[PDB]
Design a protein around this ligand. Structure first.
Ligand SMILES: *Cc1c(COP(=O)(O)O)cnc(C)c1O
Ligand SMILES: *Cc1c(COP(=O)(O)O)cnc(C)c1O
Ligand SMILES: *Cc1c(COP(=O)(O)O)cnc(C)c1O
Ligand SMILES: *Cc1c(COP(=O)(O)O)cnc(C)c1O
Lengths: 434, 434, 434, 434
């Protein structure tokens, strides 16, 4: 892989060992190029920087002999720029097409293509045979891309939306100027869900009126609400021959959701969208979009206007190469034990106060009831180093994802992938104190 | 600004001299916090990194004594992740609200607020008292933002678009799902433009249809195409009480463009969008949005679904601080000379060959007609490491930004900000060898 | 500790929390300055770099308002210079005085004073109440500094040297231009050693000749040879009032050696020299000199002609801060387990090989006698990726540190401070294949 | 140089282009390996780091498949360690032989060797065809290395030393434990010099009493003292067949001294020693030893006890690659222009008061006599942000390099290579305000 004139400096024996050593050290980098799969063992940072560097040197703006008189030559002022862009100053993709190789880049294009290959590989490790693409934008902004693709490929003009009250997906629908048709949730004990029956009727109504609907199902949401029946909805859509897009914000981190996706993929799921920071532990900013429909993923990368920053994509490529499949499946295992601990501990506090360890579906988050004002108990936690706890009032429509009155005033906590025991033990402790 | 126990280690005169030094060194950093203006002298990389680290250590996730049990606690896996994000793992803003401080960040919120004030300061220096926001997305996507803001603020549902053949802004309209009323260009010998009389006309038409027209004008585009009459368009939109958005990709780097803007703001201009890389020499992937109406900027910052990456915004702050006002003016002066050098050389090349040094409006690019296939000539140039020169056919509609048959086969070159003298000479020279 | 203007950008509650985070993040650095001892827990790389930056910013050459008209003003050319010196371009100390602060480098002088104070606390927690100095040169060169000192202070002109076959110390003696009185080792079963009796007779013979003897003993050496009776030699050097220098190459890591040191300091011991790399896992290049005589340590720092590089001294500080007292004890504890494993694996290997798990004093290394050429076996090992084991014929005089004929042909392996359970199991299995 | 599998990812023509850019970007690095000379143009820091990386990867500790159970595996605890050592954690040289390749580190050995060859092509370009070696220690310690080499190779046992009152070289002769015969200086106007006739009789006299004399002459020294008649001493040393070592601390930077060395090599010069910080804008800590005798360079190399840190040697390398020969010449020319600016300015201040502009030999330093206590003036300058000025009393024997009463109380200022105009103008106007 690497070879340079080193003769006449050291004796043959040392010369050969140095070469043997140099090749072995570079082996992990060489395999990525040759196998393009998520490595079993995580690769060290310095070795990944050397990898990104090998690709960054292939971009046009790195040529010392070229005469540059273009309109966007990608000149940068500070070195700090090269650090943040990882050397990919020309950003990613060609105008109006993300996954399309940029003639001025070349290095950035290979890293993008390699990153999607490895993402797809990662999915196969998890049991999902899909076509995947890392997106340089939020998951909500990524949903827009999907909504926009369906809108141009099938003609969608209205979105059937099983109620999921999160600012992102809601704003994504309005961002693309598409009409929404909500589908209220219903109460059932301590839960809230959306009857697949009402969705099918919403779909029928829209089709009766002359529209071409498409469903935006939601697979991962806060405790109160049940993951939608992705499988069922997926059948309906196939029967009606309508596009189905799934908001899988944090579906990739655990089996509970992966299985639903596996079974839903049997029928119609045009695309799934997932957060890269919630699932691959990447800093905020990027998304993962996957599906069994190669045709649809391409359209998705054709919805993005202009060129984008390569940084978020590189961050993903960095989670994949840095963690590796072993360490990932291990974080997933640690998740399970963290959750259980979170339950068989939060349930104990139910004995102390009034009680009632709510019985919700979430394989990540738990909920406990309380008398005091949730919002206040929450803020009282914010001011105790605790980050992430939610305090919802039974009268909090948006927070409960239920238009009527909810049955409890609670405090939900999460056991996301990568959560440390301390986050659990001590979050519960700071809780008892109130 | 910085203080720590140093006593009982070194003599007093050294202890004192030492403190004196640490203060002078930080002087540039604290001046940024105190004044919040673009400094006259560019600050060196090491100091900017320290400035960014200071802000970085204020973000929740860096609290060694914190407790995260949230659904999204910004846990990163690799240090590389911190480098790329520059320590802003949480990213920028709240969900669907870019410029609204993120409770879990703080340091990231400060940094962004500073970027925007340092951005405005920078604009003031250039002669424009405007409200500005650095966006974490491409200029095309930034236009989608502005469009979407026009939709929820003034209910606009149609975009009047004086023909400007560029994939990104065109897609930008399609993405937000708004119809487009195209206003073709007219040929005028060597120049191509869009009659203002026709734009107002298109305005009256769409209004008669019951729609609420919105104007997306183009101030900066390739040679054949003139800049749209931004000032006249702004008067019209003032009269009809109709929104006006201006695609001003590379308006900031040149005085010719800044002047029309200064005049245009005299009337109605809700927003102007510029590439952060074409003007602040940042890697591709950043945007600059500015306007005299603070109310519209707030709306623009509420159009982005979800939370965004912090990186492109940090690239913009690195440019302004690293660059400084002095150097920027120097860069601008050099383009004026580099341009005039380009003009005369090309004019010289003319005469010796078939001739004809096209007379176009652009202050950065120049053209010269040729009696051979333009695409083959540009090809040969590429074969000489000359990057950027375009070879357009008189029949290439998208190239000439004209839907008819242009009057010439030519080659265009640019004297973009940052161009070297050798580049102009080492370009017109090679073209002559052809 | 860190105060900069942040008002008028973020709401009060986020302002407050922002600070709580910032102070907490720096608490560890703040504690070093306040306590100046080895931290209980290790400090991460970023905090240490930050800590070192704070100190280097106090160096005269970093002063933007400085005025430098000297022949030696640390003008450096490349940023890499800064990185490698860690910001200490002036180095440490003054010409001929390492410990004496540099008026041109208050920062470099502070980190060095701190490094020495922190190093002394590291020792006290290992049970040694001493004055320690981190030296900018290897242990062999460090020994020269000691010998040079013993000459300035006591007029020493001859070194009685209990035979220890390591090229470094022997070359240290000749470098300082001092004659050497080599006290041959004697055989005793599987062990070789220098009888305290013949060391005394050597000493008294040099005094009879009218010379001022100096004793350079060796506490740490390869298995074949026992450690020198430091306690007796100290008892003797004292009665004869003669300087005693100890080569404690790798005595810091093993408590077996520390104990002998503790009991030997009750007598005559001017200084002990240890390698920073072998005990603190530092890159090769530095040393550690120490004793109960603050007077002798002062003279030692006045024996290095000219000014020294800062780097090796910083590498030693990084080790102390990076590890922490806690992590260190685990290393020492893990080494006890690795040695137990090694011995029981080698012992079992000898039962089925041809026998003989040699009886040697080494706490870190153990030997197995072989029935065939050792050099060959050690070469088969070397060829199998195993590095470090030595193969030694019963004839190799330098290798057995015995001028007579050693009773065995053997292989010796080490279980030094950072050895992994896998390497030992592995290296032994491969020894078995052979 | 670089070759990895990139097919089936990008269109072929782009694939070729990226491969061309990559190769062109690696040219400067490719040349260092093939040519092994200082490049006409300086190489940017990023490529220098990469170059160092290709080398560090060859060291035996970076080998992943290796089983480490040796006594000195070069294990490192912090990533900072690998940064301060530039990857060469095993240091440089074998035990007791610097320039000899270390079987444990082919990388460090390769780099060291390249550095010595590149250092040699730098001298050749300055007019000196010499054998050179970069050392990991101070020029003073480097002088001890030569003295030691002289002692072993030729049997020297007494240093003839023309008085050069600098703690460093004086300490070097003392360190090596050699008897020093001082040859006093004589007063002649504002100059102090060592008559060669005095030197020769000293040699003669030492030979007389059976001893074997070695001459340590000083070529570069503080203003008052003239440079020893290096050429004559060299001629004389050849006639007597006696070793000759020259202290050329800062001779490389000024042609005035290089011309003297050229004429001097025409006779007898065993070795010259120079500071790499004062001549190569390197951080403090490294030396440069050179001579036309390759046999003597090996001997010096065999004078260092043990293994050494690689950092000082990497610093020298970095300086040669970073500056380039073109820039080095611009530094040499700026200093001549800065020297004259220092003079005329000091002559002006001469008239402002009593003061006399002393007529000294120094091509880099110049002095102005003053009536008040020079030591109090040098102190005031310090307070006023000035480092480097010397304030010597007519009675200060060590400061004047003369055992009698010098004829002036004066202040010394330098215009060493790399000095800024601001340092010069501001240092004088600061002296003026006093
Ligand atoms: C460069 C440019 C843009 C911006 O495109 P993005 O990829 O979104 O940065 C838009 N319009 C014109 C005319 C341009 O030249
Ligand atoms: C986190 C999350 C998202 C993604 O939000 P972005 O800010 O766009 O990354 C979307 N939907 C749900 C239910 C989420 O929890
Ligand atoms: C490691 C060691 C030395 C010192 O070697 P240097 O290369 O000078 O650091 C000296 N003696 C012994 C017994 C050693 O183990
Ligand atoms: C500066 C100087 C020295 C000191 O060199 P070190 O690197 O500190 O050993 C020695 N001799 C002369 C003449 C000097 O000018």
């Amino acid at each position: 892989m690497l070879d340079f004139n080193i003769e006449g400096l050291i004796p043959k024996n040392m010369e050969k060992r140095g070469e043997l050593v140099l090749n072995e050290y570079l082996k992990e980098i060489e395999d990525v190029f040759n196998h393009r799969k998520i490595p079993e063992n995580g690769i060290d940072d310095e070795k990944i920087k050397l990898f990104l560097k090998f690709l960054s040197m292939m971009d046009t703006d790195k040529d010392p002999k070229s005469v540059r008189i273009g309109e966007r030559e990608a000149r940068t002022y500070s070195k700090i720029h090269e650090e943040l862009s990882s050397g990919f100053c020309h950003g990613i993709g060609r105008s109006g097409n993300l996954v399309d190789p940029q003639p001025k880049a070349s290095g950035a294009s290979i890293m993008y293509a390699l990153t999607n290959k490895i993402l797809e590989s990662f999915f196969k490790q998890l049991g999902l045979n899909v076509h995947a693409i890392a997106t340089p934008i939020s998951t909500g902004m990524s949903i827009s891309l999907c909504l926009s693709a369906a809108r141009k490929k099938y003609g969608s003009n209205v979105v059937i939306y099983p109620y999921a009250s999160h600012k992102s997906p809601i704003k994504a629908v309005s961002f693309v100027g598409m009409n929404m048709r909500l589908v209220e949730t219903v109460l059932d004990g301590d839960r809230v869900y959306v009857p697949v029956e009402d969705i099918e009727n919403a779909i029928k109504k829209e089709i009766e009126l002359g529209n071409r609907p498409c469903v935006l199902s939601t697979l991962t949401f806060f405790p109160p609400r049940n993951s939608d029946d992705i499988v069922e909805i997926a059948k309906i859509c196939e029967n009606y021959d309508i596009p189905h897009i799934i908001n899988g914000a944090y579906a990739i981190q655990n089996n509970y959701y992966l299985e639903k996706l596996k079974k839903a993929f049997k029928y119609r799921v045009d695309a799934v969208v997932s957060s890269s920071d919630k699932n691959l532990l990447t800093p905020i900013g990027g998304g993962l979009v996957y599906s069994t429909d190669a045709e649809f993923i391409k359209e998705i990368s054709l919805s993005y206007p202009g060129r984008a920053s390569a940084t978020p994509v590189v961050n993903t490529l960095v989670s994949l190469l840095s963690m590796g499949s072993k360490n990932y499946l291990e974080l997933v295992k640690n998740q399970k034990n963290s959750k259980k601990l979170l339950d068989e501990l939060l349930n104990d506090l139910s004995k102390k106060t009034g009680g009632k360890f709510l019985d919700v579906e979430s394989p990540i988050a738990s909920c406990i009831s309380v008398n005091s004002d949730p919002v206040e108990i929450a803020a009282k936690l914010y001011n105790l180093r605790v980050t992430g706890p939610r305090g919802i009032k039974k009268t909090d429509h948006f927070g409960n994802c239920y238009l009527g009155t909810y049955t409890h005033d609670y405090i939900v906590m999460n056991a996301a992938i990568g959560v440390r025991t301390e986050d659990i033990v001590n979050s519960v402790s700071k809780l008892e104190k109130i």
